Design a protein around this ligand. Structure first.
Ligand SMILES: *[C@@H]1O[C@H](CO)[C@@H](O[C@@H]2O[C@H](CO)[C@@H](O)[C@H](O)[C@H]2NC(C)=O)[C@H](O)[C@H]1NC(C)=O
Ligand SMILES: *[C@@H]1O[C@H](CO)[C@@H](O[C@@H]2O[C@H](CO)[C@@H](O)[C@H](O)[C@H]2NC(C)=O)[C@H](O)[C@H]1NC(C)=O
Ligand SMILES: *[C@@H]1O[C@H](CO)[C@@H](O[C@@H]2O[C@H](CO)[C@@H](O)[C@H](O)[C@H]2NC(C)=O)[C@H](O)[C@H]1NC(C)=O
Ligand SMILES: *[C@@H]1O[C@H](CO)[C@@H](O[C@@H]2O[C@H](CO)[C@@H](O)[C@H](O)[C@H]2NC(C)=O)[C@H](O)[C@H]1NC(C)=O
Ligand SMILES: *[C@@H]1O[C@H](CO)[C@@H](O[C@@H]2O[C@H](CO)[C@@H](O)[C@H](O)[C@H]2NC(C)=O)[C@H](O)[C@H]1NC(C)=O
Lengths: 346, 346, 346, 346, 346
């Protein structure tokens, strides 16, 4: 029998299908099952506090007016251009900053109608979602991104969103991030929005991401270590080499200050302290203490033999004193941020 | 009774509803009640003097031609696609730089019509609003952002805007800004625009924002303090160490100049002085004075025993003189900017 | 009488109003009166040589076919959606780089038709207009921005543009620019474009803008003064302190070179000299001369008592010689750029 | 015979051509032959890991309902505006980040229909495709870009994509890249996507690109060599010139650290080591070793004649020892990255 | 006679004008005459290798079906909104990267039809055209921009493009570029594109541009000269001032390296050498040679009277030797790049 006729017969003016009316206009709410597939995931920025994702969005619901029985086939595909004659839910993303469709050669849409009236709807989207970040423990941190899917114009009495019982969130094979690691377990929960206009449905996804130490360890931690050792070099120089020792101290202090200033080049202007700030503060304290030690020795040496060995004893003590205290500080610093990071994400 | 018929019966050619005519074509003006809900608020930039906001906008007005009495239901929802057949006010934002709608899956719109003719209209918007800023007292300042809602084509005789008596401006729970604090009280007032073309209605919202000292105190104030103390270190060096003392002074002065230059990296090119400028000027004065003190001592010492103790007395006085004057300056500077900031915002 | 009927009666197929024909198809040209209102004005960039403006554009012309006499009202407002059925002039901006409309809630348009046939048309626009700049006398300069309004498809025989006799250009109250001052007098003149295709009408607006010295005086002039004085400090040091004096000279010269390089960070790569370039060249000459003076003294002192006082006399002369010549240069430099800037803008 | 009639006769309501139905609605799948022509290729960025391409896309398939026999001509061209009445495949690019059409004067489209029903379809596109990169061996690396062409709404039972047997990928004459070399052989293979919704067809293209050493050899490798030689210069200085030798060492170490930091200015924050990182680490080790050598000599020399020649022997050994070890390191480093790069790309 | 009727009479369904058919469907090809007018020209970038232009594009061709004889007027203007009913050629730009129309108040289009059937078509466009650049002889170079105009869907048998015999390319009066000079003579030639789909027509324009030395001479050449002279200053210092001479040499070498690195801030990463690279290499060689000369003198002086005058003779020779060789190098360098630039552009 001719396939062209049934397309308008099912849902035209002859049938009386009005796309502006819910499948059950007076009765129980419409239950919608949601499902996403993460195609691409990246472009995480701390300055603007957002990330970009590319997904396929799947929806399923039942419309009794779309049932058919005269074909022998159980399921049949449709055309993207005829989506304007079918009622569809008004899903939208709450934490969105910007989004757009894809129309590279045709409309990237999929529609499928079953015998009993089940509808499968799949579209391709790209999103710029906002994600607040807690930058305490900055180089060693875990973040939790959020994705919200809620209705806009339909109250809880009409639309109710749900998650598919099995496999709600799927990730494409081989997906990797240059800077983060994406965990394999996801948290699924519920919203409920209350406004002046009423009660609205919402569902939520949580992704856990861990930062990598490979880049930061090369970039920030090692050069400060080299500056500290370079400052320590001055303890073996003759005490009479005043221009040499003073120049070494001043250069080390200024370089440490510039490095500490440059450590916050690509971060938002937050108002609390961080791990990298503590590390740079301790390094500044060490180099400043070395320069003050030389200043004290230089002042002591010119008090005119009992004043000669007094100056030498300070250098002898300092040579074995500074690295030991630095080692103790390193031990405590690295232990406390591996017992504090050990706390559960949830 | 069939729900499909009344949709066109109420407002089609049969009823004679013309969307190009006001609800009361000849008579009292149309009174519109406005209401906003702040979903997101951020991206404040001093260079371009603007900020970005994401809001829901609610409007309410009475249209006598839209009254119905045959349904038993008190209120009934509509479809977003039929908003083209209803008269709507021409609200727009005066201080806008750019704005756009949202159509991520459907049109983010809401429409609701009551029995007596009341209309509720809700849309989702994102805005880039302009906000002039007074950068005097730059690190310790309070700013007042402005949002204006005015008509464009209708004179005061036709449209009059008003605020809802209770709860005009609402803020989403947990909304925070990385750099500012948003006050909980808002100022609501009136406009009245006069042009060559006539008299137009306007309403205004004011938000008060306070800056945070956490970032700036780490970034700018502390390093200058360290540079000043580093310059003070030179007073304990032997007066014969001319290359050491001169190198220390030159390095400190050049570093202070570079820091002062870098303190205005992300600010508009204003033509008045600021608190941070005063602080950097005083620091430059201090380091320059220290270097001039050493120059004076070096010139005095070579005038050939009465000239020997004269040079030593200057160093002895300076060692206890410089920090005391710096402390007095700090006390006055921090007091005056906490009694001047104490002034009321209004 | 019913207001809905006359809307189509005046300008539909019944009346025979064809929007593709001029009001006087064969006869005298159509005279159009123009009027603008500057809502916002800013974003001036020297690198790209353009500025951004937000204006209301008003036009007035007479159409005999739109006359009505049956209403008692003298003037009546219209709807923005019906502008597609009225003939409108094809105005466009010649020096435009980019422009767009505004449709934030509705179309920001205004239409008004009088009894005799007068039409008032008002729209809201944002513009990115190009403005060539003469960067000679860069920190102390006056610029003249241009706005051109010309036709595209209608020859001089059909459309003629004119300015309103009183109040053609109006500025919103309280409008300020962070860097410039906008003069209160505007220049209005005529164009006439000649191409291969014919003769076209044009009108022009000129805005005069003056730069502010507050930012540049802090940013560039004062640090160079401090570097020059820092170089002068070396004349009081002992002549035997070769590492100290040479290090001071080298540091001052390198810092001056870096400052001169950084003085052109945000300017187009023009091929002529400017005031700031002259100032930096003179500062470089001064510091280089100081270092050469020390080199000459150091070479003279080791020619082995008649050679001892010869070296001291050079320092004694230089100490009082350098600041005096610098003061004379400052006097001439500041006088010549306040008698040359005194020239009339026109 | 009139050419206008057949245009609608072939594919209008009279013929009964429904564009929403496949050429063979029930039967074997539609076989589509693909072909591309690379017009422009560039804008490769490592930070965002993507590249931009401009191509012509050709498709060929057979539609039995479009056969004609009454013209004598074998093939006839069409108009771009009538592409809305012909069934076309829903091709799209999987690894796309953004794409758009071209409509500069008309729609850049081509359509051609043969006597037997063959269809040729050509469009112009620009693409921003994502390409993961392995930055190990960073200055000397080969990358493999990927282009995927897959269906969205049609299962494997309906659409099957194939490559043209001869000349699938063509490159415009004279196409060059500033930084890379494009190989003349391309790899063509198959996809097969499996989702929850079914089985979909895909085809793939691989491009091999090689980096050029000309820029990096000037930018990074040579300055580090000069810094190493500059550090070596210190071995010929008198051992008593403590300020000179220490200043030389400190300046060289700080400059090497700054260069190593600046070597990663435009690269993603990866977490593994690279060739340039190894080179900078070795250079830092060399300069640090030179400074430690001077520190050891300075400490040894002041142990008070047997201690005098001991210090001189260290300098004599070091002068001929450092360049030899550096040469051996250079030989091994350059050999291992020309035997490891010798590995086949596939 | 009524002007409204003939507008549809000439080209509607009554006349049978089909816009999808060429003026001569079976016969000689359509000859199109092209003409451009350059309104704005700028935004030349070496990094992305493109430039932006704003032009008017004129086309002329003959359509026999559009002839009229009943008006007395020889030529008559039309409306922009009726361009959808006239056949127009499918011109497009081959080397385009991006383009867009202008619709600031109306569509910026012009149409004019003559008695015999001649059509004049004028539109306003902005273009971002790609231009490969040869950066050899970088500060002193001449570039040749290209503009290509070719068909897309019509074979050589149907459309043939031609240039107007007189005045094909016109430039607006007073057009200037900040960095380049535009020559007054243009090169006009032919294309012929061969693809798999057939033979297509093309025409080409060439613009010759010369760079200006004013900016680069101030920015790069002079500071390197000052650094070289600063290095030469060291030859007059006492040979015993080891810290002073070594510090001067190290500072000069490091500053030269930083300047050479900064000379390529805004250039693509090409793999060949340039004039500025040669200049910086020679400057680095000079400063390194000066430092090696001091190292040799310092090593020679401590070989213990015959060794004393040997060290002094080296300084005496070097003082008159270095500037002479530098002058010879400058003479050859400036001669060879003014006899090589003397080569004809074609
Ligand atoms: C959508 O899901 C809800 C929740 O399961 C359904 O509501 C239930 O419906 C059953 C059958 O009528 C009742 O026995 C329950 O009491 C209902 N529970 C609640 C909380 O309402 C609803 O029927 C579903 N909608 C449709 C159209 O099937
Ligand atoms: C809109 O609000 C205004 C202000 O309240 C109303 O104007 C008043 O109307 C009442 C009732 O007719 C009069 O008694 C007052 O004198 C009016 N005041 C003014 C200042 O005009 C107006 O009627 C309202 N519009 C509608 C449609 O209800
Ligand atoms: C538009 O303005 C022009 C200029 O004033 C008008 O042209 C004049 O018209 C008067 C009345 O017919 C003549 O006496 C003058 O000789 C005309 N001058 C010129 C230079 O043409 C023109 O009539 C106006 N157009 C309309 C429709 O009123
Ligand atoms: C599309 O190509 C496939 C693969 O060649 C065709 O499938 C074959 O068709 C022939 C002829 O009917 C059969 O003998 C083969 O057994 C088929 N092979 C497979 C794997 O199905 C298919 O017929 C082609 N489609 C059309 C419309 O020609
Ligand atoms: C377009 O221009 C071509 C080139 O001049 C014309 O082709 C010539 O036409 C004349 C007149 O019929 C012939 O005598 C020549 O032999 C043709 N030359 C070629 C190379 O074909 C063509 O006729 C023009 N088209 C139209 C419609 O006038």
């Amino acid at each position: 029998m001719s396939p062209s006729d049934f397309l308008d017969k099912l849902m035209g003016r002859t049938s009386g299908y009005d796309a502006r009316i819910r499948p059950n206009f007076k009765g129980p709410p419409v239950n919608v099952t949601c499902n996403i597939f993460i195609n691409s995931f990246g472009s995480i920025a701390e300055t603007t506090m957002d990330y970009r994702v590319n997904i396929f969005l799947r929806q399923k619901w039942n419309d009794p007016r779309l049932a058919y029985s005269e074909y022998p086939d159980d399921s049949l595909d449709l055309d993207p251009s005829m989506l304007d004659s079918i009622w569809k839910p008004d899903l939208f993303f709450a934490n969105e900053k910007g989004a757009n469709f894809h129309e590279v050669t045709t409309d990237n849409k999929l529609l499928r109608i079953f015998k009993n009236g089940n509808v499968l709807y799949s579209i391709r989207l790209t999103l710029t979602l906002s994600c607040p970040m807690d930058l305490k423990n900055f180089p060693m941190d875990v973040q939790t991104c959020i994705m919200q899917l809620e209705s806009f114009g339909y109250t809880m009495n009409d639309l109710i969103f749900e998650w598919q019982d099995e496999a709600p969130v799927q990730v494409a094979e081989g997906l990797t991030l240059p800077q983060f690691l994406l965990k394999e377990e996801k948290d699924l929960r519920y919203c409920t929005k209350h406004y002046n206009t009423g009660k609205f449905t919402c569902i939520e996804v949580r992704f856990h991401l861990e930062r990598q130490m490979g880049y930061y360890l090369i970039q920030m931690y090692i050069p400060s270590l080299l500056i500290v050792i370079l400052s320590w070099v001055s303890f073996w120089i003759n005490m009479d080499a005043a221009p040499a020792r003073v120049a070494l101290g001043i250069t080390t202090v200024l370089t440490m200050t510039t490095q500490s200033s440059g450590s916050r080049a690509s971060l938002p202007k937050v108002s609390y302290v961080k791990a990298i700030d503590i590390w740079m503060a301790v390094c500044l304290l060490f180099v400043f203490s070395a320069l003050l030690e030389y200043a004290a020795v230089n002042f002591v040496s010119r008090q005119h033999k009992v004043f000669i060995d007094r100056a030498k004893k300070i250098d002898t003590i300092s040579r074995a004193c500074f690295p030991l205290a630095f080692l103790i500080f390193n031990i405590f610093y690295w232990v406390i941020y591996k017992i504090l990071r050990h706390e559960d994400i949830h």
